Design the sequence.
């Protein structure tokens, strides 16, 4: 005897799977009882979550709108078409000059599909070096020649770096490398870079060497949509992105590509649209995840609202005011400030490693992450932490609140130094000072009470399980 | 001024995005007002949907449980660990002999990660030919040498076929090809094959030529869990799968791999675990989709229930009873029946193509899909349709109901023939008979009223928008 549909199929999660339900409730509390400073994290809207968890997951729709393998896609077609047109509107793109594919499962699938579309296996790519703030999907191999990124397994990558004294991209050494190496593709955009990108100069380098130019704007796509940073669309052939992070949508990916006449120097047009779509499907993916596309469409309408432009503005102002607070304390930021959503904090002048500060923050439910500074590829443990504003800004925090966050980080570094001074620099010694540290418990209590003063998108704090 | 969190972040979808909400409601009606016979389609549970649309989408967790890039993962870790142990339990696997990775975004990402883990670029692969019922991710190039599947772009594939007269896999030609070609990897499992697989024979062939053996059980994983078909685990090195289709979970993928000592063939052990994990991350993916992993963990507990075993039994019985009904009418099935969830209906003896039947069915809200028969790679339009039982079985339909489904299919083919007889064999002529066809409108009405008689998992038909 099969279970009645009502028993297995309509019964709520809280009854069907109390273990999983309970774990989700604990994670919901964790999300609103600490301070989330991971620069790639955000808290998305209830509207997005409702579309994400919907009957849209029940439909196979391999293909493209109006050209599907299977029938019964009349409404899936409308959702994806609306998602795609909203994607162009959100980034102020003319439909005759730009197209977009909204099926990539996530950011890294979007990049690998873009590469597959325009490159052959073993074609050359350059991207921002990982210890300079680049992303894995832009290429990564170890000093021993071990190929880590799929980008470096299936293509030939070479990284470019920041200037090791200023922290800004070294545009002169970028050009020299591109002229020696002759990449078929140059990637710009990154994960841990605190300044804007000079896309115009990347276009000059790509033109001089003969490269395609792609921007991976995952970290700053929300700022791009709000026209709060430079638009990569003015200069790049292809723009990839996640749809979470600062865009505040579901976890998905997008590939934008140029269409129509190629700009003056015969009468040729861009040729990306078909190759891009074909790389995504049939070459690489199966059925699109239509609940993600529906949820993404929701996020993209929200990203076009005046409220979202005000959010991106506030994200930028919060990161600035946090940085200025830290510098007012005598701390060092790479490049001495920020132009986007994050700061990169250089801890080496204090004699600390990023790990020690990350660990102690984590014990206080402040989530940051350790990060290399000035492109240092040394085996030396990374010398900094990366701190982002999107997540707390989404909970409604403004400058005064981010100045308080800086106070908590100040106290965190102070406690880290007191421990290092009492127990010693070596990691084994440092950990001894974390065992039953009262002062850590007071800061942890302090940040929880601060954390609980603010609202939460995505679920109602008032009907949580754990308060 | 930013929007208050309550406005942008807590407001329901129905208010935030009426367009998208309305489209989801129409898709919900479509899903319960027709007959869904796409063999890769299912209807998942509300419990899975509640986990899928949850605050789990807000957390970055690159890495593995207990070895993450970022802090704050204590509950994500417990969810993934429980998902993994539930995955092993669902398929009756000893944890000392088998491990699993549950981060693949979907079926195709799971396969490509498995290949990346155990193969170098351009290594040789064989898989079931697409017109013989294989899947794209197993290798596909065209007659002109055009590499379509990423599997054929980054690796060197060669397909094996069914016997063109019996419809069963040609195990003799498989062995001969494998000995000539010397693949590093042989794939078994497929998308439109109506019989069980002799994994024992694939193991003999793989041992004879020195190949790894992988089973892709996407289509039948639910039947595998319920022990209603042969287990690939007894003979294969690696098993990949989707988590939707007959498993009835969210859209995701899994990679199972052997652990522990190898069978005599030195005290050596299997070496897959670390390579597989590393291929998924950091090589290919970014952050896992924790809402999928949570929903997947729910689905896997559900797949271990006695009700789910009875479901898989019923899926098989319904497909059998449907096939016997069609053959009772003089129709031909490839291999003359089924041993799993689908039948493959050979229409060429009626002088018809799969397209014509698919299109007319689609106009009656019966969703099937056209499919090549007997591995015919000819350019002639495919001569069959593929029909699956999972989706209707999940709405509670039993043998009597699937005999009624065959009646609707009988009437559908009967009208397809009347139209061809009146208007003509060429495609252009056939379409003329679809214009305002009363008899089609009657079958469509008959299908909707039959469809309405059954329940629906995943949402409450009571509170639908469109009734």
Sequence:
């Amino acid at each position: 005897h099969m279970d009645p549909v009502s028993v297995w199929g309509n019964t709520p999660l809280a009854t069907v799977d109390p273990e999983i339900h309970d774990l989700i409730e604990k994670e919901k509390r964790r999300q609103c009882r600490g301070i989330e400073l991971i620069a790639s994290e955000n808290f998305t809207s209830f509207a997005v979550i409702e579309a994400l968890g919907s009957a849209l997951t029940n439909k196979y729709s391999e293909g493209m709108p109006g050209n599907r393998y299977y029938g019964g896609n009349e409404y899936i077609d409308q959702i994806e078409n609306l998602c795609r047109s909203r994607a162009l509107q959100a980034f102020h793109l003319d439909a005759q000059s730009w197209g977009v594919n909204v099926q990539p499962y996530s950011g890294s699938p979007a990049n690998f599909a873009a590469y597959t579309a325009v490159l052959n296996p073993h074609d050359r790519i350059m991207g921002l070096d990982l210890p300079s703030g680049g992303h894995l999907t832009h290429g990564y191999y170890t000093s021993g020649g071990k190929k880590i990124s799929a980008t470096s397994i299936y293509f030939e990558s070479l990284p470019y770096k920041v200037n090791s004294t200023t922290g800004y991209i070294d545009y002169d050494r970028l050009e020299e490398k591109a002229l020696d190496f002759r990449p078929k593709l140059i990637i710009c955009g990154g994960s841990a870079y605190p300044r804007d990108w000079d896309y115009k100069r990347f276009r000059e380098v790509a033109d001089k060497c003969g490269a395609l130019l792609l921007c991976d704007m995952a970290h700053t796509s929300g700022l791009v949509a709000a026209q709060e940073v430079n638009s990569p669309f003015e200069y790049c052939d292809i723009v990839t992105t996640t749809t979470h992070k600062s865009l505040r949508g579901p976890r998905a990916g997008m590939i934008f590509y140029r269409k129509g006449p190629k700009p003056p120097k015969e009468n040729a047009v861009y040729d990306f649209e078909d190759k891009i779509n074909f790389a995504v499907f049939p070459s690489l993916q199966g059925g699109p995840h239509n609940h993600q596309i529906g949820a993404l469409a929701v996020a993209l309408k929200q990203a076009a609202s005046p409220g979202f432009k005000a959010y991106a503005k506030q994200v930028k102002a919060n990161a600035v005011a946090l940085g200025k607070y830290l510098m007012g304390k005598g701390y060092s930021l790479v490049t001495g400030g920020t132009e986007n959503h994050l700061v990169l904090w250089d801890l080496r002048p204090l004699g600390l490693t990023g790990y020690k500060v990350e660990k102690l923050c984590d014990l206080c439910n402040i989530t940051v992450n350790k990060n290399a500074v000035f492109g240092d590829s040394s085996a030396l443990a990374p010398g900094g932490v990366r701190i982002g504003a999107p997540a707390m800004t989404s909970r409604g925090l403004v400058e005064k609140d981010f100045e308080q966050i800086g106070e908590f980080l100040h106290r965190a570094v102070t406690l880290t130094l007191e421990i290092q001074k009492e127990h010693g620099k070596l990691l084994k010694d440092f950990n001894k000072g974390l065992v039953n540290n009262k002062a850590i418990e007071d800061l942890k209590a302090d940040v929880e009470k601060f954390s609980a003063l603010f609202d939460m998108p995505g679920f109602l704090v008032s009907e949580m399980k754990y308060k």
In short: Chain A has two domains: 55-303, 314-463. The first helix of chain A runs from residue 5 to 9.
